[PDB]
């Protein structure tokens, strides 16, 4: 009843799924009740062969059957699923649905300005994906190649990804907010032979540069042989390099509306998605084909309760894993329409999300708490203008959801009639790890609830490294066996992969997160233990920001840490020591970060100090910057172990004077 | 009586002669003209249930197909037997070599009969594997294109099959093309290799073959290597070192068997140019069309011998001098010479020599033997023939009767086959021993071909019989060309955009009160 | 009593010792010699119904085959399991790793025992996947060839399987070959990559490996990249920037699983050079022969442990140190060293250490151990042994008795296995526990091997027993080599054309009244000109009897009309007619050379007829080559 460790769970009223959820459910639920979920979950752990075997044969269409469901171990980093099987991602996301119902909506595309919105059916999607795949084929793209995509969140980004996967190549989607430098680093690490981009973008009604940044990056990308450019704005002033750049519309018009998909092995790579960790350089997280697709389909169907009649609106960007799995692969695998929103939640006004839901009668809505906090602050008044009664599942992703935000989400968006799915997962997991199945698992606001099929979650004592038995516990969140959609490697750097996920806690997968498990088995995410900073849902590398600040010849040393933020969840604070206007130089360093990484990595604040605290070796002690960036300087303790203990006073004074 | 189709007024139906059935080795494939319409209507109304089983009957698959038909004419995305895999050379050679290795395959009649030979299916498999082994050794792989510039002899048939054995597309270039026309076709397809010969023989005279390639290859950088056959063995012929190699020298280095390479149903099988436009044909669709029409329009049985007096530089040789016959495991006669060499009885010496059962030629040759070789027909025995075919042109009702009595002796069936390179196989033709004939008429459309007439002025389909207009088809068919290489726009503007929802044949035709279609020529 | 096969007179048949069956883990795969003949007769008369089921039993298929057997010897187009697809590394590694990943796979005994180690099947899958991942990232793919120049250790086995995992064909180059011998083999195969090590250790001595490769690679432009294993980690071994990369550095970048690539049954699995000729073996047929012979001739069960004391540089290591044992899922002992280092007991210390049940070695090694180390054998417990194999050469009845007594303690079955590189697997051998032995005889032909004796003058088959002649085979078999790389005409001229309708082993043999075969010496020069078998050595002697000739060299070359033609080069127009009559008088009318070319001097080494053959078709004194090319044209 009472918890001594997991205080979040004390006196928390369990929240059953509202009765209206089942009234709006088009068919019988995919799972009967929570007891059937526990029985199925236990088979997915104890007998993954008999559990995932049948599900893989139901939900995916195979070109060659698989002979072995599961292989390898975490400790040896050789996980594999559905071995010997062959399939194609674009066939399972497009072809098979187009043959069955070519006129069914596939991509419900809401542009930055609604006047530019349009809907592609599955038949439309097959023809356009076939044409792009025909261009890439004519250019020499083939199984084993990588192709970069630098596109906003619109139809062309989806078509590019599916066209690449149709040939057996792996796509590497580069979020449209990345700078030229970040584009360069990602294209070169993957040795991409081609790039798919557009001339310009539309964001909040403003024209954004896209091709311009690519040209800047491509000067140092010798592997890129040809570029496909979509005329998003058709601006005649956008230059194309003769012999390298070609127009989407011109080249697709040369090839037919059907191209055979290329069968690939279950374990052939489907895509690279570069991610930021505690290292200084982005790591290309590699996902398999069959296992990743199955996880996407499984979680989308069972956690969100998706039926053929439903319509999913994932308010994410394909530049991130959320868009990968739940705006593209998840929905299209199940054959339902997915809403691809190119704009922002604030344009033309803070009701846009709800105008879209009402316009298309979306049944499922998936968004990050950062957006919920913004609409609670600036757009609560807009909600009453829209009919949101078509909704029944409300998802939350990317970061902790406050109990308060949970209630606001539940009341103002769901009218206290929808099921909320707080989905915990990460880029490397491919799909949901811990989440309340819609209509099945009752909720505790702020808790992700139970682990999903194939996810044998555990807590590890951070002092002893041994697994913690029993409930009312806390520790490092780890997973005891691999699962179908687990990332298989870091591109051309499997040693970093092993050192990051498998070697820290041998026999386990290290999520990088801490968590707690209450007496009912519900998991409560406590945050990253590895000091990875997550700003507005964007996973960031503090080391990458430190490197950017140092490129400025004026900076001698820099240290970046994360702190709580009422708006972005977390914010990065940069401490800079100069060699030697203070407000002017502070703006110069912030712009330096925007140029090298991107606008979304810029520090919320730059604190200029005379000296950083260090060890007797000379290493910077960021632990002191963290306790100061929060009002916990009284917890720094004995600092006589520092070589420069006198610097601590200046750091407390500088932070108090310059943080604002 | 007809008010529109003036060609139809007073034309007596010409039932197939009774002697056509005495010479049939087995019960015909279709009983009467009535059953043909029960099969035809199903092929229009239920293409999935009609062509699906036929595809499994006539072709051998390495991977089953999951969808029989996809796409529409309006969107130029037609596809057949999606998901399936197969290999053209396996269906034309391997599977018959295993069953009967010694059965004849290529009955080769050279320019001089003194150089005529024959290749059994066992021989053909060994010769195609060795040439394919050469190409595989050179780096030729699935997705490449290989040009052929050869006369009408064994080497051309082997070259096409060897190229398809690796899953590459062969682009055949008629041996009577100029170096310019050669350069244009090779560069459009970016062919990595070329198969030709030192020099051919056309009616006694020797023709410059390699000399024309060399003049053209100087503008074809994509060509890495050339395989040269010794048709005459002339030493004065120059082979550029490091590029040109001898057929016999390279094939001697490789074994008599090479595994075929599986290709998807919709992987291109060949480019064939008509600025020249490269007509691209799929693999499964085209092959099925070739075998179906060969089986039902000509009434080909395993015991039959087809003599298509055409050249593989054109579609007629593609479909009915190579693929059509060999898919059915029957022998086909590859004639390199001319109808006048040694004299105007060569066609008849060959028919008599090999007891050919089927003959297939264009009316252009009929007008040459009508006005020069009408007498040589009686010297030779033409009693083996059952079906006589016309192709390429409209056959004058004059020439139809001449072709019937002089060659057919009033005892054979005549089928006026109408079709284009873009159709892959026969569009409208009378079936042997099924469809009665009207001299000069193509008669009824074939399975899966939903013929229609369109008023050119309004663009609206003309209903009811006794009408004329632009000939168009209402749905795509398995052997329909899928695109024009690297130029699908020209493909849409030519065939699909003139009349959306239809296939523009480029011809004008008329349909009389009996449904018999009369081809009135190009528009 | 025998009037022809004198080896068989008074030879006591030697039954399999009772201890053999006591140590046998399960019931034997064949009950008795009577059951063996029933199976053998089906393998000859009905290979479709015999090998079909066995291929489905012993091999794992990615695509089913539609035809068990195709082609003929006469046409050199033999093929088995047509339309089938599989992967060699999947059948040797993956499927066993899934079933029991901790089962030992490669028991590796290094030159110095301190460096020995054991790889499980799970270990092997990870290491093969990683190397295959390095090669894949380098662009190696189906249809490529990859050279291996490695000692007999884990890296050689891993390299071969990693190459086969991508559908490329490996070409193993014995680590003792010189730079020149490496050059010829890499260029004939146009290998795109090479896998080697910095230095080797053999008998405690450091051998140069990379140094010889660098020397050869300067003239091997097809090699794009080299993978170098740190066997000694000698810091002075130079690596060329942009071409050479370290095994450990690159494998660390890639995951422990990589999908295998399906290949056709008849796609080449490997080239093995022997001018060196690249013997090409198929995939499906070769693997089936390896598994079949390993299982039935050696009597291999899942519980057994095989020690083939051979080198992967030769076919013996290919078939019976790697493919045979791993296909059946058993551990195989990979010995890097010599039988004398650190001492002459090493072979027996290894058998005792790992309780090997099967031992396979060539008589050359047995003679050495009998001469220098007989005393050491009794120091070790060899009671785990049950099958003793002999390969590569005749085994004397005396050496057989010594082998049987001192190694086998008169308790083991001996399998004298006759075969050759081009046969892929055993041709004639006594099945362990089934066929009783006659010392020195290979006994009965194996499944699918229709052995016969043919008269070497007429090529006609010899009926009945107590006979001797050319050992030939009447039909092809699954593991028969398919060609010589890019030189199928030499293949045909060597194996299929000398005795049309037969496969020519090059060996003589005799068949006694019990049907046992006794391998005799090698057959001499056989040139077949319009059916007349000729001896080039016999013609040279006749030309030399002419006092005008100082030296003479006769060789054979392909001929489109007469099959083969002999060309005589003479070192000293009218005299040319005098020499031809001399050959007709002393040898026979049809033995005259097609042409006699008079030269100033013949090539020699220390006669190099390999040069004369390549000249008649289009060391020491290299300048003489110019004059012979002009003389042949004159
Ligand atoms: C919750 C907010 C969602 O919208 P927001 O992140 O503002 O991005 C709006 C649109 O612009 C693209 N985009 C994002 N950042 C940039 C950027 N920095 N430059 C260009 N395009 C960008 C982004 O991919 C989508 O298509
Ligand atoms: C899923 C999209 C974001 O992926 P990625 O950029 O890799 O960030 C993953 C991390 O976000 C947190 N996180 C994610 N979801 C939650 C969640 N539902 N509750 C709390 N923290 C969360 C948690 O720290 C995790 O390690
Ligand atoms: C159709 C009538 C038969 O005679 P004709 O086509 O003129 O030539 C017969 C033979 O010569 C080839 N051939 C055709 N035209 C030329 C030509 N112009 N140059 C070289 N060879 C040619 C043709 O492909 C076959 O192998
Ligand atoms: C198939 C052989 C040659 O193909 P190709 O060179 O593309 O020419 C096809 C065209 O020739 C006419 N045509 C062809 N055959 C006939 C025919 N049998 N009757 C009337 N016109 C015909 C008709 O115009 C058609 O569109
Ligand atoms: C397999 C080992 C070596 O293969 P390879 O190098 O190709 O040599 C094969 C030859 O070795 C002899 N030979 C091989 N095994 C025996 C044997 N068991 N008895 C006698 N001679 C033998 C016989 O001459 C044969 O043609
Ligand atoms: Cl099942
Ligand atoms: Cl702390
Ligand atoms: Cl040598």
PDB file of C-alpha atoms in Angstrom, chain B residues 2-190:
ATOM      1  CA  UNK B   2     -22.807  -2.518 -94.138  1.00  0.00           C
ATOM      2  CA  UNK B   3     -23.013   1.247 -94.615  1.00  0.00           C
ATOM      3  CA  UNK B   4     -19.669   2.133 -92.981  1.00  0.00           C
ATOM      4  CA  UNK B   5     -17.304  -0.811 -93.480  1.00  0.00           C
ATOM      5  CA  UNK B   6     -17.238  -0.856 -97.280  1.00  0.00           C
ATOM      6  CA  UNK B   7     -14.655  -3.660 -97.190  1.00  0.00           C
ATOM      7  CA  UNK B   8     -17.272  -5.897 -95.534  1.00  0.00           C
ATOM      8  CA  UNK B   9     -20.034  -5.777 -98.170  1.00  0.00           C
ATOM      9  CA  UNK B  10     -20.303  -9.274 -99.636  1.00  0.00           C
ATOM     10  CA  UNK B  11     -17.344 -11.222 -98.217  1.00  0.00           C
ATOM     11  CA  UNK B  12     -17.936 -14.959 -97.872  1.00  0.00           C
ATOM     12  CA  UNK B  13     -16.654 -16.405 -94.605  1.00  0.00           C
ATOM     13  CA  UNK B  14     -13.757 -18.806 -95.196  1.00  0.00           C
ATOM     14  CA  UNK B  15     -13.947 -21.690 -92.736  1.00  0.00           C
ATOM     15  CA  UNK B  16     -10.696 -23.503 -92.036  1.00  0.00           C
ATOM     16  CA  UNK B  17     -10.099 -26.346 -94.534  1.00  0.00           C
ATOM     17  CA  UNK B  18     -10.858 -29.878 -93.397  1.00  0.00           C
ATOM     18  CA  UNK B  19      -7.272 -30.827 -94.280  1.00  0.00           C
ATOM     19  CA  UNK B  20      -6.016 -28.574 -91.469  1.00  0.00           C
ATOM     20  CA  UNK B  21      -7.389 -31.027 -88.886  1.00  0.00           C
ATOM     21  CA  UNK B  22      -6.024 -34.139 -90.612  1.00  0.00           C
ATOM     22  CA  UNK B  23      -2.528 -32.742 -89.988  1.00  0.00           C
ATOM     23  CA  UNK B  24      -3.090 -31.742 -86.348  1.00  0.00           C
ATOM     24  CA  UNK B  25      -1.031 -33.998 -84.036  1.00  0.00           C
ATOM     25  CA  UNK B  26      -3.523 -33.637 -81.162  1.00  0.00           C
ATOM     26  CA  UNK B  27      -7.003 -32.376 -80.370  1.00  0.00           C
ATOM     27  CA  UNK B  28      -7.028 -28.630 -80.958  1.00  0.00           C
ATOM     28  CA  UNK B  29      -6.542 -26.303 -78.000  1.00  0.00           C
ATOM     29  CA  UNK B  30      -9.961 -24.676 -78.510  1.00  0.00           C
ATOM     30  CA  UNK B  31     -12.863 -26.626 -79.989  1.00  0.00           C
ATOM     31  CA  UNK B  32     -15.049 -24.094 -81.819  1.00  0.00           C
ATOM     32  CA  UNK B  33     -15.263 -20.336 -82.285  1.00  0.00           C
ATOM     33  CA  UNK B  34     -17.922 -20.288 -79.556  1.00  0.00           C
ATOM     34  CA  UNK B  35     -15.630 -21.547 -76.792  1.00  0.00           C
ATOM     35  CA  UNK B  36     -13.068 -18.940 -77.860  1.00  0.00           C
ATOM     36  CA  UNK B  37     -15.513 -16.208 -76.823  1.00  0.00           C
ATOM     37  CA  UNK B  38     -16.186 -17.834 -73.445  1.00  0.00           C
ATOM     38  CA  UNK B  39     -12.429 -17.756 -72.842  1.00  0.00           C
ATOM     39  CA  UNK B  40     -12.070 -14.289 -74.378  1.00  0.00           C
ATOM     40  CA  UNK B  41     -14.861 -12.700 -72.340  1.00  0.00           C
ATOM     41  CA  UNK B  42     -13.393 -14.114 -69.124  1.00  0.00           C
ATOM     42  CA  UNK B  43      -9.966 -12.765 -70.098  1.00  0.00           C
ATOM     43  CA  UNK B  44     -11.561  -9.303 -70.323  1.00  0.00           C
ATOM     44  CA  UNK B  45     -13.925  -9.493 -67.335  1.00  0.00           C
ATOM     45  CA  UNK B  46     -11.781 -11.701 -65.044  1.00  0.00           C
ATOM     46  CA  UNK B  47      -8.112 -11.276 -65.996  1.00  0.00           C
ATOM     47  CA  UNK B  48      -6.955 -12.470 -62.564  1.00  0.00           C
ATOM     48  CA  UNK B  49      -8.711 -15.832 -62.844  1.00  0.00           C
ATOM     49  CA  UNK B  50      -7.895 -16.310 -66.541  1.00  0.00           C
ATOM     50  CA  UNK B  51      -4.222 -15.350 -66.888  1.00  0.00           C
ATOM     51  CA  UNK B  52      -3.141 -16.525 -63.434  1.00  0.00           C
ATOM     52  CA  UNK B  53      -3.579 -20.229 -64.168  1.00  0.00           C
ATOM     53  CA  UNK B  54      -2.193 -19.815 -67.690  1.00  0.00           C
ATOM     54  CA  UNK B  55       0.923 -18.159 -66.266  1.00  0.00           C
ATOM     55  CA  UNK B  56       1.485 -21.172 -63.998  1.00  0.00           C
ATOM     56  CA  UNK B  57       0.772 -23.630 -66.828  1.00  0.00           C
ATOM     57  CA  UNK B  58       3.060 -22.208 -69.510  1.00  0.00           C
ATOM     58  CA  UNK B  59       5.913 -20.603 -67.536  1.00  0.00           C
ATOM     59  CA  UNK B  60       8.233 -22.081 -64.909  1.00  0.00           C
ATOM     60  CA  UNK B  61       8.665 -19.844 -61.865  1.00  0.00           C
ATOM     61  CA  UNK B  62      11.542 -19.533 -59.410  1.00  0.00           C
ATOM     62  CA  UNK B  63       9.313 -17.514 -57.052  1.00  0.00           C
ATOM     63  CA  UNK B  64       5.522 -17.449 -57.158  1.00  0.00           C
ATOM     64  CA  UNK B  65       3.698 -14.220 -57.955  1.00  0.00           C
ATOM     65  CA  UNK B  66       1.250 -12.742 -55.449  1.00  0.00           C
ATOM     66  CA  UNK B  67      -0.738 -10.357 -57.695  1.00  0.00           C
ATOM     67  CA  UNK B  68      -1.808 -11.107 -61.258  1.00  0.00           C
ATOM     68  CA  UNK B  69      -2.502  -7.537 -62.390  1.00  0.00           C
ATOM     69  CA  UNK B  70      -1.881  -3.987 -61.178  1.00  0.00           C
ATOM     70  CA  UNK B  71      -2.025  -0.449 -62.526  1.00  0.00           C
ATOM     71  CA  UNK B  72      -4.040   1.359 -65.181  1.00  0.00           C
ATOM     72  CA  UNK B  73      -3.479   2.758 -68.659  1.00  0.00           C
ATOM     73  CA  UNK B  74      -4.239   6.294 -67.458  1.00  0.00           C
ATOM     74  CA  UNK B  75      -1.329   6.154 -64.981  1.00  0.00           C
ATOM     75  CA  UNK B  76       1.163   4.144 -67.072  1.00  0.00           C
ATOM     76  CA  UNK B  77       1.984   1.804 -64.181  1.00  0.00           C
ATOM     77  CA  UNK B  78       0.861  -1.549 -65.562  1.00  0.00           C
ATOM     78  CA  UNK B  79       2.318  -4.672 -63.968  1.00  0.00           C
ATOM     79  CA  UNK B  80       1.641  -8.401 -64.169  1.00  0.00           C
ATOM     80  CA  UNK B  81       2.565 -11.288 -61.874  1.00  0.00           C
ATOM     81  CA  UNK B  82       4.059  -8.994 -59.251  1.00  0.00           C
ATOM     82  CA  UNK B  83       6.437 -10.659 -56.808  1.00  0.00           C
ATOM     83  CA  UNK B  84       7.177 -13.522 -59.179  1.00  0.00           C
ATOM     84  CA  UNK B  85      10.673 -14.442 -60.322  1.00  0.00           C
ATOM     85  CA  UNK B  86      11.770 -16.425 -63.374  1.00  0.00           C
ATOM     86  CA  UNK B  87      14.379 -16.492 -66.134  1.00  0.00           C
ATOM     87  CA  UNK B  88      13.746 -16.254 -69.868  1.00  0.00           C
ATOM     88  CA  UNK B  89      16.601 -18.544 -70.903  1.00  0.00           C
ATOM     89  CA  UNK B  90      15.493 -21.199 -68.407  1.00  0.00           C
ATOM     90  CA  UNK B  91      12.004 -21.267 -69.927  1.00  0.00           C
ATOM     91  CA  UNK B  92      13.351 -21.228 -73.501  1.00  0.00           C
ATOM     92  CA  UNK B  93      16.242 -23.694 -73.110  1.00  0.00           C
ATOM     93  CA  UNK B  94      17.023 -25.345 -69.769  1.00  0.00           C
ATOM     94  CA  UNK B  95      13.626 -26.874 -69.018  1.00  0.00           C
ATOM     95  CA  UNK B  96      13.428 -28.423 -72.499  1.00  0.00           C
ATOM     96  CA  UNK B  97      17.045 -29.610 -72.494  1.00  0.00           C
ATOM     97  CA  UNK B  98      16.369 -31.602 -69.321  1.00  0.00           C
ATOM     98  CA  UNK B  99      13.200 -33.148 -70.769  1.00  0.00           C
ATOM     99  CA  UNK B 100      14.493 -33.927 -74.284  1.00  0.00           C
ATOM    100  CA  UNK B 101      18.110 -32.863 -74.873  1.00  0.00           C
ATOM    101  CA  UNK B 102      18.216 -34.189 -78.445  1.00  0.00           C
ATOM    102  CA  UNK B 103      15.012 -32.475 -79.592  1.00  0.00           C
ATOM    103  CA  UNK B 104      15.794 -29.877 -82.288  1.00  0.00           C
ATOM    104  CA  UNK B 105      15.743 -26.230 -81.221  1.00  0.00           C
ATOM    105  CA  UNK B 106      17.367 -23.941 -83.836  1.00  0.00           C
ATOM    106  CA  UNK B 107      16.982 -25.271 -87.389  1.00  0.00           C
ATOM    107  CA  UNK B 108      19.571 -22.933 -88.894  1.00  0.00           C
ATOM    108  CA  UNK B 109      19.524 -22.317 -92.655  1.00  0.00           C
ATOM    109  CA  UNK B 110      22.487 -20.139 -93.612  1.00  0.00           C
ATOM    110  CA  UNK B 111      22.841 -17.949 -96.694  1.00  0.00           C
ATOM    111  CA  UNK B 112      24.421 -20.872 -98.546  1.00  0.00           C
ATOM    112  CA  UNK B 113      22.717 -24.129 -97.590  1.00  0.00           C
ATOM    113  CA  UNK B 114      26.192 -25.708 -97.560  1.00  0.00           C
ATOM    114  CA  UNK B 115      26.648 -23.935 -94.195  1.00  0.00           C
ATOM    115  CA  UNK B 116      23.314 -24.949 -92.643  1.00  0.00           C
ATOM    116  CA  UNK B 117      23.334 -26.663 -89.248  1.00  0.00           C
ATOM    117  CA  UNK B 118      20.934 -27.590 -86.441  1.00  0.00           C
ATOM    118  CA  UNK B 119      21.142 -27.134 -82.663  1.00  0.00           C
ATOM    119  CA  UNK B 120      19.253 -29.396 -80.288  1.00  0.00           C
ATOM    120  CA  UNK B 121      18.012 -28.020 -76.983  1.00  0.00           C
ATOM    121  CA  UNK B 122      20.945 -29.801 -75.349  1.00  0.00           C
ATOM    122  CA  UNK B 123      23.312 -28.038 -77.738  1.00  0.00           C
ATOM    123  CA  UNK B 124      21.561 -24.694 -77.243  1.00  0.00           C
ATOM    124  CA  UNK B 125      21.965 -24.934 -73.463  1.00  0.00           C
ATOM    125  CA  UNK B 126      25.702 -25.584 -73.743  1.00  0.00           C
ATOM    126  CA  UNK B 127      26.250 -22.756 -76.234  1.00  0.00           C
ATOM    127  CA  UNK B 128      24.152 -20.244 -74.274  1.00  0.00           C
ATOM    128  CA  UNK B 129      25.908 -21.106 -71.002  1.00  0.00           C
ATOM    129  CA  UNK B 130      29.365 -20.600 -72.522  1.00  0.00           C
ATOM    130  CA  UNK B 131      28.470 -17.211 -74.022  1.00  0.00           C
ATOM    131  CA  UNK B 132      26.752 -16.198 -70.784  1.00  0.00           C
ATOM    132  CA  UNK B 133      29.870 -17.404 -68.982  1.00  0.00           C
ATOM    133  CA  UNK B 134      31.904 -15.040 -71.154  1.00  0.00           C
ATOM    134  CA  UNK B 135      29.609 -12.110 -70.372  1.00  0.00           C
ATOM    135  CA  UNK B 136      29.549 -12.954 -66.658  1.00  0.00           C
ATOM    136  CA  UNK B 137      33.350 -13.097 -66.800  1.00  0.00           C
ATOM    137  CA  UNK B 138      33.363  -9.593 -68.319  1.00  0.00           C
ATOM    138  CA  UNK B 139      31.275  -8.148 -65.476  1.00  0.00           C
ATOM    139  CA  UNK B 140      27.876  -8.225 -67.196  1.00  0.00           C
ATOM    140  CA  UNK B 141      25.202  -8.533 -64.514  1.00  0.00           C
ATOM    141  CA  UNK B 142      21.511  -8.034 -63.818  1.00  0.00           C
ATOM    142  CA  UNK B 143      20.509  -4.492 -64.741  1.00  0.00           C
ATOM    143  CA  UNK B 144      23.049  -4.032 -67.535  1.00  0.00           C
ATOM    144  CA  UNK B 145      22.137  -3.756 -71.213  1.00  0.00           C
ATOM    145  CA  UNK B 146      23.998  -5.557 -74.007  1.00  0.00           C
ATOM    146  CA  UNK B 147      23.757  -4.608 -77.683  1.00  0.00           C
ATOM    147  CA  UNK B 148      23.496  -7.203 -80.453  1.00  0.00           C
ATOM    148  CA  UNK B 149      24.440  -6.475 -84.085  1.00  0.00           C
ATOM    149  CA  UNK B 150      24.181  -9.816 -85.889  1.00  0.00           C
ATOM    150  CA  UNK B 151      22.463 -11.296 -88.959  1.00  0.00           C
ATOM    151  CA  UNK B 152      19.570 -13.772 -88.702  1.00  0.00           C
ATOM    152  CA  UNK B 153      21.440 -16.898 -87.632  1.00  0.00           C
ATOM    153  CA  UNK B 154      22.208 -19.046 -84.597  1.00  0.00           C
ATOM    154  CA  UNK B 155      24.626 -16.526 -83.100  1.00  0.00           C
ATOM    155  CA  UNK B 156      21.879 -13.915 -82.741  1.00  0.00           C
ATOM    156  CA  UNK B 157      19.538 -16.321 -80.937  1.00  0.00           C
ATOM    157  CA  UNK B 158      22.318 -17.512 -78.622  1.00  0.00           C
ATOM    158  CA  UNK B 159      23.372 -13.927 -77.887  1.00  0.00           C
ATOM    159  CA  UNK B 160      19.886 -12.833 -76.810  1.00  0.00           C
ATOM    160  CA  UNK B 161      19.373 -15.921 -74.639  1.00  0.00           C
ATOM    161  CA  UNK B 162      22.843 -15.639 -73.091  1.00  0.00           C
ATOM    162  CA  UNK B 163      22.206 -11.988 -72.194  1.00  0.00           C
ATOM    163  CA  UNK B 164      18.839 -12.838 -70.629  1.00  0.00           C
ATOM    164  CA  UNK B 165      20.473 -15.752 -68.787  1.00  0.00           C
ATOM    165  CA  UNK B 166      22.369 -13.247 -66.620  1.00  0.00           C
ATOM    166  CA  UNK B 167      19.335 -11.007 -66.100  1.00  0.00           C
ATOM    167  CA  UNK B 168      20.619  -8.287 -68.422  1.00  0.00           C
ATOM    168  CA  UNK B 169      18.549  -6.689 -71.177  1.00  0.00           C
ATOM    169  CA  UNK B 170      19.581  -7.300 -74.783  1.00  0.00           C
ATOM    170  CA  UNK B 171      19.106  -4.383 -77.194  1.00  0.00           C
ATOM    171  CA  UNK B 172      18.974  -5.919 -80.669  1.00  0.00           C
ATOM    172  CA  UNK B 173      20.092  -3.702 -83.558  1.00  0.00           C
ATOM    173  CA  UNK B 174      19.084  -4.874 -87.034  1.00  0.00           C
ATOM    174  CA  UNK B 175      22.189  -5.864 -88.986  1.00  0.00           C
ATOM    175  CA  UNK B 176      21.198  -3.472 -91.783  1.00  0.00           C
ATOM    176  CA  UNK B 177      21.630  -0.332 -89.685  1.00  0.00           C
ATOM    177  CA  UNK B 178      24.156   2.435 -90.246  1.00  0.00           C
ATOM    178  CA  UNK B 179      26.996   3.303 -87.890  1.00  0.00           C
ATOM    179  CA  UNK B 180      25.034   6.401 -86.905  1.00  0.00           C
ATOM    180  CA  UNK B 181      21.906   4.412 -86.084  1.00  0.00           C
ATOM    181  CA  UNK B 182      24.180   2.007 -84.194  1.00  0.00           C
ATOM    182  CA  UNK B 183      25.803   4.801 -82.179  1.00  0.00           C
ATOM    183  CA  UNK B 184      22.404   6.268 -81.281  1.00  0.00           C
ATOM    184  CA  UNK B 185      20.926   3.016 -79.950  1.00  0.00           C
ATOM    185  CA  UNK B 186      24.026   1.954 -78.011  1.00  0.00           C
ATOM    186  CA  UNK B 187      24.408   5.359 -76.349  1.00  0.00           C
ATOM    187  CA  UNK B 188      20.739   5.653 -75.354  1.00  0.00           C
ATOM    188  CA  UNK B 189      20.960   2.352 -73.454  1.00  0.00           C
ATOM    189  CA  UNK B 190      24.579   2.801 -72.278  1.00  0.00           C
TER     190      UNK B 190
END
